[model samples]
Each structure stands twice: as C-alpha cells, then as structure tokens.
Target chain A: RSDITSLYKKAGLENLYFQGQTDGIYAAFDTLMSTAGVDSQIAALAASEADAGTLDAALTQSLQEAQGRWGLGLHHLRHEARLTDDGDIEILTDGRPSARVSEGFGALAQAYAPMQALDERGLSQWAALGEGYRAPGDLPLAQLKVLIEHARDFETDWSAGRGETFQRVWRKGDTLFVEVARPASAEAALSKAAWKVIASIKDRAFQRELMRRSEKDGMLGALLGARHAGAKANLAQLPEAHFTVQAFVQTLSGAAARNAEEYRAALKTAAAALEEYQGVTTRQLSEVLRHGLRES
Target chain B: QGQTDGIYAAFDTLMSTAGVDSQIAALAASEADAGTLDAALTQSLQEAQGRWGLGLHHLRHEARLTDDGDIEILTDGRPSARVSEGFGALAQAYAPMQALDERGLSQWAALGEGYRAPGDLPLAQLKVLIEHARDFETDWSAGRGETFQRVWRKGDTLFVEVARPASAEAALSKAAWKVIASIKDRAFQRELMRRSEKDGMLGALLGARHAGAKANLAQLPEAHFTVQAFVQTLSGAAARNAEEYRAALKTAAAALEEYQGVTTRQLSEVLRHGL
Candidate 1:
C-alpha cells in the first residue's frame, strides 16, 4: 500500500537511481525508506491491534514541551558554528544558544551596551566619528554608553570572529577615553592598543583621497606627500623618555608617507593618551607643536 | 572606475562569484584598499575566478501608472525594467558568488540604512543585487540558505506573525519556533531566487531540485507535514550541496532512480517550468 513505487522515482534521483539496481530492486529499495525507523515500522505492521492515540499523545506531549521551553525556531542555516567555520550567523535557541562570538555577540555586548542606547542624534555622533554604526533603540542609553565606552572591545570581537571570553574594555568618565584589551592586561597594554581599526584603514583611504582633494584645492600631486620638519621632547624624564622617544621615531620613520592623515591622527591620539595616563595636560606639547632649525 | 551602476553590477557579480569566499576577499580588499576601496579591483572577476557559483531568477510585474504621469518602478512587469545596460536598466543581473561569503554578506547586510556606501548604485539597486545573490537558483530547487529571503520580504505580511513576538515568553514559545522556521524557509527561497537571478539555467536547476524534493517528500510517512518543509529539504541538496548527509541521501536516491527514467535531463526539463 506504499504510495511510493521506487526510491529512485520518488526521491528524484535523476540518472543515478537506475544505474546499479534493476527495476525490481529499485521497487524493493522504495519500501526501505517507507519502512524506515524500527518503532514506526512495527507499529504500522500491528496497526489493526494498535491505538494511534497513545503514540500520538506521547509525541504531542513532547512536542508541546519542546514548544513551551525549547521553542522551535528557524535559521538561515542550522546554528552549527563548527560546521561552517566561516563565522556566518547561525540560529540558536535559549536551550542550545551558541557561545561563539556570532551568537548575537559576547563580551563585546557589555562593551557595546553603554554606547548601544543613544538616541538617533546621539548614535549619529559615533557613526560620524567613524565607528560606522548606530545604537539599537530597544537596548536604552545606559547600556549603550557602557557599550560605547567599551567600543574597542566590540571591534576586537568583530575582528576575532568567534568566542565567548573575548573581553574588551571601554574606559568610562567625562572624557571619551576607551581601552580595548584582555581584562587581565588592559592596564599595562593601553599604550599599545589602537582605537578603531576600520577608521585607521578608512583614514588611510582618506589620505589617498586627500591627494585628490589637495589637487582640487590647487596643490601639486608630489607636494601632497610633504611632511613637516621636526623634534622637541621633555628633558625632565630624559633617559626613560629618550629610549621610548627614539623607538617611536624609528617606528614613525618606517612608514613616513603611508596613511599620512592616519599617522597624524595617531600622533594626536597618542599625545592625548599620554596626558590621560599622566593626569596632566601637555602645556607646550599640547597640540604636538614642534619647531626645529634644519641642520641640512 | 570611479563609480557607476555598471560598476555596482560588476560588484554584484563579483560578490556572487565570491559566494562564501567573499569573506576572505573582503579581508584582502579591506587590507589593500583600507577604506579607499578600488571599485574596479574590488569587482574584478579574477578575484573570484574559482568560486562556487550561484543561480538567480526574476519575475516582473506589469507596469502600473502612479498618481503622477511616470510609471511606477516597483510595479510588476507591465513594462520591462531592463533599459539595455542603463543604470537600473538591466534585467536582474548575477552577483559574484563571493558576495555570499561571510564578510561580504555581513558588510552588505550592514548597508541597510545609514551604512549605505556612497556609490553610483542606488539603495534599491544594491538591495536587489544582494537579494538576487543571497538565494541563488539551485538554492530554491534544492531549498537551502537564504534563497527565500526576498520571498519572505515580498510577503512580509505573511511572515509578520513569525517575526513579531508579542512578549518575551511568546517569542520563546512554539509561535517563535514557527516564525523562525517560516523565516528560514523564506530565506532559503530568497537564496534560491538569488541564484536564479544570476543564471536563468540555475533557476531551472533549482526548480528541478525543488520539484524533486517535493515529489520525494510526498512519499514520506509524514509527507503531509507541510508542502513547504518537504520542498525545502529537497532543494537543500541541490542548492547547497555542502551537507554530506543530505547530499548522500539525495545522491543515493537520485542514483537509484536514474535507471527508472529519472534522467538528469528530464529532471532539468521539469525544473525549468516548475513542477
């Protein structure tokens, strides 16, 4: 009484279904799937003496439980992170929620929460500043502020692709000071970390675009690559500052022309970071002003 | 080269070609160009030469007059949208498979509102580009991925019950599950639609997979569970043949049925016009 005649015809196996098996064998195979699952097959054989009610109730009860606690949801694909490995979004339930970074975010969630609640205009400030995003209205301002202060962590989470303990921190206060690093080493490594990787990259683009802008502004293309003549450093902490300053000079020398705008921006930011750490304003060195006589 | 509709179209093609590989391409491009993306290099076919391809389909509605004298752009195919290579003039073109890659897809999705990139491409054009690529042709027939994303989007009302949860607990209940499932089904359809739009033949193949899945699932014991679910799994094998288990099942079945008149050509024919 199987409605299916052969597995080949029914499954729409196309050409391969008929290659190895005879027509008779194909018909036999059709019976296999129809009779798949031991319990269901036995129940079918004993249909005359069975009560479909009992099984139906049991299955229905479990289905209801699943419905109640472990709701049935659908995803673009099964929330199988290990399977994809490409860090694509996956669907997960409270029952089987993913611990991976793509599971609607992780530690960065805390970082983002503070800045996550800004109203339309407030959210635009972050976007305008090149964070390239807006706040989710449903979340609230306090949550968003926390998230924004910790925005660095969010970028790190985005870059790393997946994980649960991806801790990132955003320093909170009147100022927009934020730090992103491992929770354990955040204090020590504040000097080394970057603020926004995208902006850094974006600024690099800006520098290139600046060449076009400078040309439009009536500057020669070659003059677009000009750099200021330079140095002045505090002698109070001379020995310690000298080594660090020399190292900085060497690093700066490596890419003197690349991402000029970003490099300048980084300098302004580095000055701010130093002031923020020392708890003192950089009076003369405030704007990174330097005047030097050319030895050449 | 600076920015144009054709460039966006080419980008669409590159994205589709990159498919899932677009993730890597995006990383590479982001690194190389930073924010200064070289539109030409970004859309270069060579970047995604060896990528897995997708299929897409487009159905036009007849032209409808607006309150103004101009014809409504969104109206169904009363008049063709194709303008013979004019910006927004081409019948839905194919996107590079790489567009389906994680990074590429994520970046594309981010373009929803304020994130729109400043390009010659309009929001509508970019949207259709992603929509067309997300669910390619094979995705529909074999039913997997976001093939049905546009379908659900088009029928947003039908999916509202699933997308909107009345309460937190309500979202956690069976209603949420049903909604999620329906949304997923819709996404799968879009994925297939995306494929078909890219290549009409892919749409034919997807339609074949879809029809075959339906025909086969019809024979299952719980065949009546829902026509949608049954059809989805069938196209799953054909659209995104990455799952070994589903592939094995479909392949084994297709292989066995081959001699019983289940010719690939015949299936192909059935899928073209749909089952």
Candidate 2:
C-alpha cells in the first residue's frame, strides 16, 4: 500500500508525476485527482469498514451535487472505487487518496469552489516556477492558500558578482528564497559611478593622469591618457572626463603622485558597495513563482 | 612602472630611456618647434601602437603641454557603447547578459551609440569593450527610493540601464563619495595645487537633453507597471477589465511592496499566529 506520489518518487518519476506534465502516465494523474479525493472522503467514513450499498449511494450523491453546481461530472472520476465491506477501493491500482473531506459543509469548502480561484496567470506562472509546481487538482484550497501567501512574502537576494543576470535557489530556515545578482553588470555600472566619483574628487582625474608622469613618461602618457569617458551623457555638456590608465598611474615622479592612488582605490571602495542594499522589489515576481513550485 | 598592457609598456620603455626624452625636448622647444615636437612625439606614438596584442583601448582627443609646464588635457568625442574588458583566462570563468519611449528610454536605447572620439590612436587595432553599463542603488535618505537598473552586452552591442534618479542625495552619494574622498589623492591635489582641475570626472549630467529624457522619467512608470502586471496576474483575481485589472495590480503592488517594503515587517510573532 503506497501513495501514488511516493511510488513515483522512488522510481525517479517524481518531477513528472507532480507537475502533471504530458509524456507518459503522468498526465493521467491530473484527471484522476478529483476522483481520488472522493475515494479518500469515503475511505475516511469507514476507516476500517463500510457497507458496499451505502458507500455507492454517497459517492453518487457527491458526484450529482458537483455536476449541478460546478459542472463537474461523473466522467471526471475515471477510477472505479468499489467497496468490499472491509474498506478497499480498487485493486491493481496504487489504491486510496489522503484527503480530509469531512462531509457536511466540508465538501463545499474543501472540495469545490477552489476552482473559482483559478485563473490563467496563476496557472501559467505556477508552471513556469518549475518542477515542484502543482495543478489545481493536486491539493485542497486551504493548503493552496498557505503556499500562495508564502510565495507573496518570500524575498530575493541580489548581490553583485560576475557575468549575467540570473535566478538561483537558496534555502533559508526550512523554506527557500531565490537570489538575483549581476556583478558583471553591477560592477560595470558601478565603475561608471566610481569614475563619476573620481571626476568630482578634490582635484581632477583629467589632470592627475598627467600630473603623475615624470618629465618624459608624463609627456608620452599624455598622448594616450587623453581620452574622454566615451559615455552616453550629454557629451557636449561634460567639458571633460577620463577613465585612462594614465589617470590611474602610480610611482611616476614621486611620493605626491603616489597618494593620488586613492582616486582609484576610492573607486573600488565605492563600487565595493555595489554589493549591498536595502530590500526592494526587483525580480521577486520570479521568486513568487519559485515559491509556488517549491511548496507544491 | 607597472605595465598595464603591451602598448603602455612600450610607451613606458620609450619614455624611461635616456635619449627619448632629450630627443623629445630637442624637437619640442618652441612656437615653431611645436610642429617639430609633433613629429618626434607623434611619429614614435605610431611605432608604439603595434606593441600590444589588444592594442589601444582608448582614443586621444587633444595633446598640449603648456608654457607653465602643466599639461592641458582636453576631451572631445562622440559617445559609443562600452563594456568591462575581455581576455583569455577569465574568458572561461566569466561571461554575459529595457524600456519604453520618453524619459530618455525612447532615445538613448543604447548607452553609448555612434560615439566616435577623433583620436590619434589606432581605431582598427584597439580592443573592443562593453559590459555592465548601469544599475541602481539606494539613497535611503528619503522615500522608498525604489530604483531598478540593468546593464548588459550582446554581440558587439553594449547595453546600459541608468537608474532614473531617486533621492537627490541618494544619487549624489553614490556618485559623489569616492570623488570627494579620493579627489584628495596626492597626484590630484598636486595637479590641483598648481591650483586647478578638470570640471568633472566620468558621469555626466548632460542636459543638452538629447532633445529628450523627460520621456524617460515619464515612461519610467511603465516599468513599474510591468512588475505590477506580473504580480496582479498571480493575484488570482479574475481580470475582466482594465479597471479591476489595474486596481488589482495596485493591490498586488501594495502587497509586494509591503512584502519587500523599505521598513521591517517582523514575522516572529506571525510565524505561528495560531499557536
């Protein structure tokens, strides 16, 4: 006696089974889910035993009610769950559903109506979040609400690093959070910030590149050191700008030029900060999607 | 010195040697001699070109040594796209990766497009460059200071996404700190002690307005609207029309904002609310 989920998990088909993907016996799971819940409801009624005739009547009543109110029909229940007085639902099947569908008002609350919450966007984004994603038939609405709330609350960590903007999974506390970092991008952009900082420094990098040169190297450095930042700002308005190595030159004429190193040092120092920040909305939408899949 | 690249090392070696300076001065001496000085300085400058494998990464705008012995660095160049740098070893380790019209997004789509700084250096030989071009950081001095930015490159194209300004002080600190602190560097100060310096550094507050940018600021909300739509779609609220759709988006925006809002929303008490 095993849950359909666990059996598939052991056999390495967990992702496919859980996602309700199309490929093999996987897609069959979504269609069979509602029926599984009804089977579970009846299973709960007898626990260890039940009358075959009484069980049949209740099952039919539940289906008739769903059809009239929500368009759910008997055809949706592909599995034939017959009782044999001792509580066995089906043979040759993985057998039985685990649901707390406690009759009375329970069927309305726990069973139907969750379909009302379904929409294209939630359904689409849920799938996009990947592997652990779930379809409506997978869980009762109560648990689904809890997962959605968790997704909305989760935050993404965006730290600076090298190359590309991407989404990565990082788990915290027993739950998971996604992180988004673009060091190559951040540092590169921050480099402009660093250069801007260099521009307004006590003096000017435009001249410092030249001031550091010895009699001749200074002369020669001037030849190449002379480029503007070559950026997009109103170039005509920016009287001058420099990102030249000559500007970063050290050990040129003596000790005085050596201290000019802070201009460059301050750059990395300022840019070093590109790595930190207070939380704000960025790629957190992706985080919400990620939360959906992980919880499901 | 520390050679940055082959071209730089070549120049350093040329300048460091004894006769090159004397020959430069010999050719360099006067109003009439400035032309001769060009031959000496300019001619050798060409020889130094082939020294680096990647070649010159920068271009020359102007070159003038003054009567007072100070150098006059004049920059003039049209802007072009930019990137970090590319090389062999880290090539494998690292690698790569906006907007509506107006507020500048309509224009300025590319960070530095079509910029050509008339230079004496070899354009054909210079190494190509483009990488992270812009991003946003907090000012925290006021408001929520929400800023979003991105920078990237594809093929030869460089992408830059400057964060539209948030807190004036916030944007200032990000661009101003290093400049203020490091401007005092001995070299900068020495250059300044001669008592003067350049008007600015790399970042520019260009207001020629490119005939635009208000477009960028106004269009900025479109980006926010983007994330809101993404959030609202996930809200489970049936979207029948723009009215509820937009209202739901606002609610979703608030939800996400409150979720990641500037201040703290302690979860300690609520983690187990029913407990």
Candidate 3:
C-alpha cells in the first residue's frame, strides 16, 4: 500500500501531499499549528547547553517535525473517525441498540466540539428519543443547532421507536450530528446518560481508526473513505419517521437566514425527501431514510 | 493506543505519586474534617514535587506511539492497556501512521480507509487501485470524492503537497543568503557570494539525493543546523540592519522552538518570530 507520501509519489507530483497549499486553512489550524505546542515541549526538555542559543529555532523546528509526525497522526485519526467525509452518522444510527451513536455524540462533544441544544424543549425532545439530554443553555443550544444538520442530511435504516423525537437546539462544526433523540425510559435514560462514556470511547476510537488509516493511506483517501462510510452506515441503520428531517431542513433554512447564506437549494432537497417519506403509503418512512441516505 | 493509554496512565501515576487521593477529599467532605483535608492537601502538595515527574514522563516517553513489532500493538498501540489504565490511554490511543504503514493496505482495506491509518494516500488508491476501496465512499477532503470523480473520470491527474517548517540551519542559511544578497559592500558581498556558492553546491547535491523528501535538507544541511550561528555569521559588523536581522533571525529561529507540550505561547512566539 502507498504511504501518504507515496500517494503523492504515485501521482508523480512533488510537494503535493506531504507538503502543499491545497488547503492553507487546514494546514494552519489542523496540521502545522495544531501540534506546534506539543513539539515545543518535547524539544525544550530535549535541548542541551549546545542547543541553548538556538533553542527557539530548535523548538520551531520541533513544531514542524511534530507537525510532520503528528500531522500524520491526525490524518490517521481523521481517517479512522471518518471526519473527512460529509459528517454522516453511521456507527450510531444503525438500528442495533448499540450505544454507538450516543457514544459518538458524547466523545465528539468532549473532543473537538461540544454537543448542545437550542432550549430546554429541544433538549428534552432529543433526550426523549434517547440521545441523552442536557439543560437548555447557550453552549448546548449552539451545539444542538449544528448537530441537526447531520440528522437532516440522512435517514437511517434504524427506525426510531416509540420515544423518538428530537429537534434542533444549537450546533457548530461536525458536532451537528449530535442530535438529542428525545427522552426515553428513566432507567434506560440513566444508562443512556452514562452511555456517553461508551460513545466517548467510540468517538476516540473513530479518531484512532482515522489516524490508523491515515498512516496506512493518505489524508485525502482517509477523508473520502470517511465521508462515504458515514453516509452508507447511517442510511443502513436509521429509521426515516423517527427523526425530524423537516425540522432539520428548517434548521438548515434558518442557518441561511441567520448567516445570509443560500442553503435554500439544500433545504429544498431535504424538503423533497421529507415529502417522499410522508408520501410513502405502504413502506413507512424507512424508505425515505434509505433514499435520504443515498441522496446525501 | 498504548502510548495514549500510557500518557493517561502516567498522569494517573503522577497523581498517585503526588499522593492526592479523592478518597481523602471524600472523607473530608463527609466528615467535614478540615484538619485532615488540610494535612492531606499539604502532604499531596509535598509529594507533587516541583517536577511532577510522572506528568513529565508521560508527556515525553509515553505520548508518542513507538516503533513496535506487533502489527496491532504497533499500529493500534495498547488498547487494552488504555482500557485498564487511566487517562494516559490518550497517548497510545492515538493511531500513528508509521505503525499503520507497516501494517499495510490489505488489513486497512478490510477495515475501511476511514479506519484512519497514518500517511497521505490519494482517494484514487482507495477507489481505483484497491478493489473494495469504493465500498466506503463518504469522504471529507474538500469534497474530493466528488472532485476526484470529475477529475479522475476525465483522466485528470491529481497532485497534493504539505510544507513542513524548515530546520533551524536551513532557515538560518536562507536568512543569511537574503541578508548577504542585500549587502552593499563589495568585499562583504564577495565573501557572502563565496559562502553562497558553497552552500548552493551542498544544497544541490542533497536535493539531488533526497530529491523527493517533504523538506529536503540534502542541499544545505547546515542551513538547518543552527539558527544562531547562521545568523551570527550573517550579522557581522558589516552585516548592518541589526534590528531587522535580529527580528528575522528570531522569526526563522522561532520556527525551531522546542518544548515538551509546545503550547499556545510557544506557537504564538513562533508566529511572532519564526513564522
């Protein structure tokens, strides 16, 4: 298999993979700068009297070195978590009573972004559906708002059961997928609350897998694989009627409203999917879930 | 995984070594034993040592995944250890590409690319070269999956690159060249010119041999060796504009700043000086 560098080599391009300007933003925040701090520490402790005058340079060099090494680690982790994709809910959305989705939500919340809800109502609704809940607050609301986009993007093969109900509260980044799946049984809910522990593990595992694949493949390939895997897995697992795709669409529309961006077309597409789910006479909304998964 | 786990474990070890037990805190809380709590806190502080050696140990030796032989142990690190250990699991928990690169494609392909192996392969490898690569599709690279479909289908060859920070010596050499190139004195210019020639020759040869490195040091290895020495040589008495040179040297040198954690301040300093 081609290493990350080999991917560029295979494409017969130098300065293409290991070093390039394709995404300066990512290069800044995600790659070089992100790990700069870690490498600095290593170099400082590792420095000698000889390294004193040039210690600053040594440390700067260390960041680059760290970036190169850990950048590879992040690339690997992203690949494993499938963060490079459109941010689909796969491992969690799949119908099995696995704590996968909840676990992912909690872990994701803990790591890069936090999970949120718009208000107490939205949080309670989502909790009712089994996503676990938090009291309404600014941070939580902001997070919930973003997570709705994730639910809006796909319909899972895993249908929501009786207590399933969720709504947008807040959101930011890929953490949008952290939906509050309506409150459920108190006993189950308590377990569900603690279930974040499991999700955190899964979330970390996702990052772990991403980093692993990054080592095996390149950042680009890992990202692509993640996106595809997320879409496919979520579609296979979630039920169509159980989620608030319409509300999700409205949330997307509201995004365009608040930001003055044009998500109209995207909302239209979501609207159409919701319509199809509502229209399905014989199959129930799962058909809509299947189609939505495929469309995204 | 072991490395990540080790980091957390080390943290736990450090906490334990510091003798800060939550149980004592619990006892204090339950019994309202301020004296005991105070004594425990003081004892814990005493044990904390100026150097929280375990924290330092975990950050240094345990954070990074090392080169091990076992495919899973090396690639995955110590996952079980992570589960059993404390927060140190974070170190080993991080999957390293070096480990995965050794583990290779077949194992990765089966698990899926989103499995996040380490390295920088293009989408083409997974989608076209690897038979099952297409099975996993939702990707996150600048819509590259869609982008690739359009480009690859039309037979557009894709290219990507990632720039690394220059080594201190290399950064210093480049700085020197710019400074020397800017010199007005003929004698100084001549000396600088000679140095440039020597430096250029070395650089050319190194680049020739390590032609494809992410950052090539073959050409002027010394350029990346020591920033201070390079700057001193460039900033002699005749090397006027001391302030600019110093600032520029700092900028170049900053990129080479070393640290244990390489925190925000360090990075900010790099931005301020090293760029």
Candidate 4:
C-alpha cells in the first residue's frame, strides 16, 4: 500500500488514490491489462481471490522466464562476436571495446566518450613535448612567443566569459608547452582558485588583504588604463613598494624604448624582482621570463 | 554590450538609481574618460561587491571606453581558496542557471533573508539525484544485508560500503561506482564500464589485465541478472588465463552492444520463447 502510494506521488496523483471512478472502471481495467501483460493479470486475479500460493508461483515463473530470456540474449550476441577464443578484441582510439569502426559503431562510441574524438595532431604534439613546461630563452623566441600568445588568449577568452580549452601552460628548461584541456567553469574555478597560485604569494592573509585593498581602490582599473610609460608615471602612489609591479612597469617601458640592451637588462631586472620580493623560485622565474616578454 | 549588460543591470537594480544607467550610456556614447565613468559607477559597484557573497574581496574591475564608444567592464581576479567557500556556494547555486540564460541577481537576491521558496533551487537538482539514487538502491539490494559491500540510496540518504585497505584502487572503484550509479542512461553506464575495464592503472594493479570485469558488470543495468549470467559464462568457459579473460570480455562487449539495440517487442518475444 505504501509502495503504491509512493508510485502515485511520483506520478503527481497522490490525492486520487482509492477514490473510485465508476464511469472509467472498465476503461481503466482495459488499460491496466494492456500495460501489465498476461502474467500480471493472472497474479492480480489470484491475489483478488486470496490464492497466495498461486500468486507466488505465477510471479516466480515470470521472473524465471525473464532471467532465461536475458541469459539467452547474452549468449546469442556473445556467439556472434566470436567470444569463444582470445584471438583479437578490437579497441578504438579512445579505448572502448568494439568490433569495427563502422558508421553504426562510431555513432555509439561518440555518444559514450566523455570528450569526443581528441585532435590526433594536438595529442601527438602534447605527447612529444613529454610532460611539464620550458623557460623562454631555452626555446626559440618564436616558440616562446607562441606559448605566451596562447596563454594570453586563454586569459582573455576566459575573462570575457567565454569557455576556454587551453588548460595550463608553463616554461620548462628549454621548451614551453600547453595542455589542451577544458579549464574549470567559473563556478568550479572559484573553489579551485583557493591554494592555486604560481609565483604570486599564496598566503591567504596577505592575498585577502591585498584583494580587499584592490577592491576598495580600483588599483587594477588604474593599471589597466596605465600601460608602459603611464604605468611608471602612476607608480608615484606605489602600493607598499611592490618590487614586482615596479619592475614589470620598468621593463614594459624599456621594451617600448626599443633598445636591445635596455630590453634585456629590464627582463633581468623584472626576473630578479619577482624572485626577490615575491619569493618566486628559479623554475617559476623561467615561467615569468617565458610569459612576460616584448618583441623588439 | 550583451556581454556586459547583465552586470550593469545587476548594479542598476542594487543602487535603485538611474545614475549608473545614464552615466554609462553617456560614457559609451561620447567615448568619455574611463576614470569619470568609474567615478560615477563606483558607488553602485561598491554596493555590488558588498551584496555579492564575501564582498568581492579578490575581484578587480576595469571600465574601458572602447574605440566603438562603448563602455566595457572587464573583471579580473581569481577567487582565492580562502575567499571562495561562501562565493563558491553562491556560484554553484546560481551559475548554472545563469549560463542557461536564467535569472541571476534576481534569483540570488531571492535567496537572501526572508525569502520564500528557499528550497526551490536545490530541489531542482535534487529531483535528478533522486532518480539516480532509486536506481542505485534497486541495483544493489539483493544478496546483501546492511553489512556487505554495496551502494544504495533511500530517499535523501545515500549509503556506501568500503573495503579495509582504502587503497588507490579501492578509492577509484568507490568513486567510479557512485558516478556509475548516478548515470541514468543505461547504454552510457555500460559504455563507461567498458572503458573503465581498459584502464591502464587498473590493469597494472590487478594481475590478469581483465581488471576484474565482474566489478564493472555489477554496475550495468539489470546488473543482478546481467552479472549472474556474465560470471556464469566466464566460469563455464574456464577463463583461467589472461587470454581467456580477454576473450570473455570481448563477448560481454558484443552482447552488451547488441542488447543496446534490442527493441521492446523483440524482448517480449525472447522472454515468451524462454518461458
């Protein structure tokens, strides 16, 4: 009775239970019979007559028949696939067991794989890079530029509320590589943002205080409008003499000046500031070098 | 503008003033100074920060007067782990709806103090979870008492039985089974099981490379009967070696795939014939 009530509640008809509908009785009976089949009808009739043993037997028979059908069906298809011997089992590129990549098989596989067919070339490129990142000077300038551009693109796209596919990029010793995976959504991104930092201070108290100050003061907005020379000029009101920010501004303006020696010196200065003040390790300094570069 | 209009609307309502609307529109129209626009919008923006969970402590906003003479608000800052707990809850509760083009600030505000329908938002997701819970309950209820290894859900409560070691393999299996049970699509669940059976980590840990196919079979639809017959076939075929295990899996995959294509009428006919 409780199970029947729960079923009724699931169907959004709880209140109507046991409320007789004289006019629709025969129609309801016909509908029930059509849906339930011969076994159910027999069991119902036996139950109505209080014939417990008959009802039990009927139910047991139905279950046994269903089990046999499922078993035979399994056996038949297994035989068709030639599962008797260990000759060969076809495995797809994304690694689902399959007989062949027929049109039908492809459709089924596509529906199943979490990510659709991965870009084979991209996968191979990523595989060849063989894990982790490379620093800027270690690789060709052009290659470093590509990695920087890719990172910038991901940041820009993500900031503008667009979905990003580039997951992470870092500079290893001599090579820079990118991981082509989906970045977490903004919602998940929030939860994940906690504890995830590179080169930047990971101290919660320091970071939170910094954020609070920035929130109140719109330091980011000012910095956005102040690029290169303007950024250095605006630094008269320096927030606690952050060496990294000052160095970044100085290097940026030097790059603007277009002197090769000055540009290289500025890069060294910026790299030094990040390490000294921000506690950026040598490996992380390389990542900064890879990302924060300007073409002469 | 469509990209930024929602954010502006959020502030517009919070401030209860036309000051932001007119100022932003004027700034956009004239390509006016961003600093001036920032000054005008600062009050509303600050109010927005306070109203938003955790006071937007880590967030940064940049107002740009574009070449096209439109004001664009570019927000920067990753939510810090320390600042994210409260913000994370808000985002999870609202972001999905917002992505689907549903109400955002309005829905958010509705969840504030003295709000009706406090349970409405979670209930939406709960319904989906309930369906999955019921399936998990049905699949694992047989030949198992409260103590044996199984996963089941009764109404709002979910149950799990873990092994002694809590090894990496055990952790993976536990996580996999929960997700598997949550999947409503039968074919998708079976496909996932098939993929999992091929996991390199599982293969390396388990001796024979079959990754204990019976564990995966346990999560398949009508798993009691399916797994019963599956185990029977493997044992009957004397799948003692790795090669034999592979042969059995190939058969299971074929049978599973064919079963996916079987129709209701065909199923009834098979059952009748068996009887």
User: What are the DockQ scores of the candidates, in order?
Assistant: 0.01, 0.01, 0.01, 0.01
Angstrom error at residue B142, model 2: 13
| lDDT by residue (tens digit), candidate 3, A1-296 | 53564454334322322243233222222222221122133222323333333533443343333322211112111111111133232221122221222233234223322222334333222222232223232223233223232222211111232224332222222222222133322222222222232233335655465446545443323333433333223222221102221221233333452231223244344335434422222122122222211111
Candidate 2 residue runs with Cα over 4 Å from true position: A1-132, A135-145, A148-296, B1-180, B183-187, B190-198, B201-275
* Per-residue lDDT of candidate 4, residues A68-90 (tens digit): 21111111111111111232212
Listed in order, each prediction's TM-score against the native is 0.16, 0.14, 0.21, 0.13
* Residue-wise C-alpha lDDT for candidate 1, range B1-275, written one tens digit per residue: 12223333333432332221234234333554422333333333222321211211122222222232222222223433332233224223333311343312212221122112123333233233222212211111112232221111111011000001011122112222232233345765555456645443233244345666554322321111101111112232233223432343344334222322212333335444463
**Sorted on TM-score, highest at the top, how do the candidates line up?**
3, 1, 2, 4
RMSD of every candidate to native, in Å, equals 36.1, 38.5, 31.6, 43.8
Off by over 4 Å in 3: A1-124, A127-296, B1-172, B182-185, B195-275
lDDT of 3 at A143: 32
Model 2, residue A155: distance off in Å is 22
The predicted structure with the larger lDDT, 1 or 4, is 4
| Per-model lDDT | 0.25, 0.26, 0.28, 0.29
lDDT string for model 3 (B1-275, tens) is 22322332333333342223324324433665445544543344333321121111111121122233111211222332332243234233432321222211112222232222223334333322112111112211222211111110001111111112233344444544444445467985675467547555223222223445224333322221221111111222212232433344344233223211122232234323421
Which candidate achieves the best lDDT against the true structure? 4
Relative to the unseen true structure, what is the C-alpha lDDT of residue A151 in candidate 3, on a scale of 0 to 100?
21
Stretches of candidate 1 off by over 4 Å are A1-296, B1-98, B101-107, B112-275
Candidate 2 vs 4: which has more TM-score: 2
